Amino acid sequence: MFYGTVSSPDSGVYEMKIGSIIFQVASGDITKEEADVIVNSTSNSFNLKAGVSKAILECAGQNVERECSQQAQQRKNDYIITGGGFLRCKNIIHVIGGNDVKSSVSSVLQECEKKNYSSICLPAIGTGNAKQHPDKVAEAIIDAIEDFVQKGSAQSVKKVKVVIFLPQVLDVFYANMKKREG
Ligand SMILES: Nc1ncnc2c1ncn2[C@@H]1O[C@H](COP(=O)(O)OP(=O)(O)OC[C@H]2O[C@H](O)[C@H](O)[C@@H]2O)[C@@H](O)[C@H]1O
């Protein structure tokens, strides 16, 4: 009921429509991306600096690092929202890599609608040190978007890009997209 056709606008990039949203997966370094929100995949303390969280915090800068620690105090947070620092985004949403990926992506999508944001970039949450299986992660990310669209919640959000660090993970996402295509 929602899926378009998988196509490729550049080598190593694949996209398909999911309702009104363009869902893209691409190879690369997320810190090179521009989007309204960039998603960080971190630990329960929000001060992880290994893997994608290291790339993100080192590029975002020390003010963002301070923001994370401060917010982590305030509450028993499931995710936190900070400024983008020196990343090319309006906000970073920091989710926990070990947490349910579908829930995490749903939260991200909701927060983006709240801010009338149109673009999101995220990594393959949980597929590194968290050791969540890439196919389960892919399934969860795409499921979250499909559910969002089904519920009629997608109004401002128009583009969701997963930036993926290795071929092995890219191929899994592509397979999961291809399985769903109309
Ligand atoms: N610059 C980058 N851009 C995009 N993706 C990247 C980059 N660098 C790495 N990746 C990919 O980012 C993906 C995620 O790898 P990880 O950064 O380990 O995060 P997690 O979510 O698995 O674990 C985070 C915490 O969650 C749990 O508590 C765990 O115990 C951790 O403490 C991999 O595919 C990387 O190749």
Atom 16 of ligand 1: nearest residue by CA position:
128
**Tally of CB atoms within 10 A around 29:** 12
Asked if residues 161 and 33 have their Cβ atoms less than 8 Å apart, the reply is yes
Q: By residue range, what is the domain housing residue 138?
A: 1-182
Provide the experimental method for this PDB entry.
X-ray
Picking from 135, 136, 155, 181, the residue whose alpha carbon sits closest to that of residue 15 is: 181
**Tally of CB atoms within 10 A around 96:** 24
Asked if residues 156 and 118 have their Cβ atoms less than 8 Å apart, the reply is yes
Domain count for the chain: 1
How many A from CA of 127 to the centre of ligand 1? 6
CATH assignment at residue 94 = 3.40.220.10
Scanning the structure block, which residue is given the tokens 């926990």? 96
Atom 14 of ligand 1: nearest residue by CA position:
128
Q: What resolution in angstrom units was achieved for this structure?
A: 1.6
Asked if residues 152 and 128 have their Cβ atoms less than 8 Å apart, the reply is no
Half-sphere exposure of 47 (CA within 13 A, CB side): 10
H-assigned helices in 3-162: 52-60, 62-74, 101-114, 134-150
Ligand 1 pocket (Cβ < 6 Å) reads 29-31, 41-43, 48, 51-53, 55, 96-98, 123-130, 163, 165-166, 169
Return the DSSP state at 59: H
